[PDB]
Design the sequence.
């Protein structure tokens, strides 16, 4: 049931980090879970610092919300920023100090593919407005895997590319007119890229949309609340049809409605 985004609900806090290491981070579930994982499996990465390698894995939502991890993976190279996703059994993440996306197969703890995103800025060239080296933002939607970035040729405007999830080849690319550094974060729903206006305001908005199917850009005024005033990560999960976000120590989720 696809459609245009028309409403975002209030943020619900599912877990709060207890140390500064989790001031920012990414948490996620797999919209295409494969054995041995399920739709309840949750991953959490606290991303403050310069040697981020620990990925916390929880078999059950109850464990994610109240307990210790059921497994900790140690990535073979340090991860950059909050943009990572899980899709069809693999963590897709950006190597620190690089424009390289890595496919890390979770069950086998193996790197299956690596790809430089052609021309992408990295390490503070085209971050979102809060900084945090957020130059490269992976996304999953109803159609699969994407990457959101910018290039010098695009003059810092958001570029988005569909990715082959097996080998990380770029399949198609679109260029928006939205300055990446001017928005707080972005995500894709049903092939439309949406941006959030502010990472600090309790009265922010989903403020722009770009539809990859029609090429049309629009403004929007949909309310979006940063309850804790520092949102470092905002992604969409197409299986749950919810936003997942990280706001100033807090792992939160938002319900949505589509037309
Ligand atoms: Ca995002
Ligand atoms: Na992402």
Sequence:
């Amino acid at each position: 049931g696809c459609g245009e985004l028309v409403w975002v609900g209030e943020p619900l806090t599912l877990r709060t980090a207890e140390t500064i290491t989790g001031k920012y981070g990414v948490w996620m579930r797999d919209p295409k879970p494969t054995y041995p994982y399920t739709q309840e499996t949750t991953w959490r990465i606290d991303t403050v610092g310069t040697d981020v390698r620990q990925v916390f894995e929880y078999d059950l939502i109850s464990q994610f919300m109240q307990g210790y991890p059921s497994k900790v993976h140690i990535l073979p190279r340090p991860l950059e920023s909050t943009g990572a996703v899980v899709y069809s059994g693999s963590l897709y993440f950006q190597g620190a100090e690089s424009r390289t996306v890595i496919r890390y197969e979770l069950n086998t703890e193996t790197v299956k593919a690596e790809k430089e995103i052609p021309g992408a800025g990295y390490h503070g060239q085209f971050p979102y407005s809060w900084g945090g080296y957020t130059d490269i933002d992976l996304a999953v939607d109803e159609a699969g895997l994407w990457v959101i970035y910018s290039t010098d040729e695009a003059k810092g405007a958001i570029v988005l590319s569909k990715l082959n999830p097996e080998n990380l080849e770029l399949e198609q690319t679109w260029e928006t007119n939205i300055r990446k550094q001017s928005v707080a974060n972005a995500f894709i729903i049903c092939g439309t890229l949406y941006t959030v206006s502010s990472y600090t305001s309790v009265d922010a908005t989903v403020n722009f949309a770009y539809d990859t199917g029609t090429g049309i850009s629009k403004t929007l005024t949909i309310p979006f609340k940063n309850r804790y005033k520092y949102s470092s990560m905002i992604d969409y999960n197409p299986l749950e049809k919810k936003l997942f976000a990280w706001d100033n120590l807090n792992m939160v989720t938002y319900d949505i409605k589509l037309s």
User: Anything to note?
Assistant: Residues 137, 185-187, 234-235 surround calcium ion (ligand 1) (CB under 6 Å). Residues 191 and 212 are 6 Å apart (CA to CA). Helices lie at 61-66.
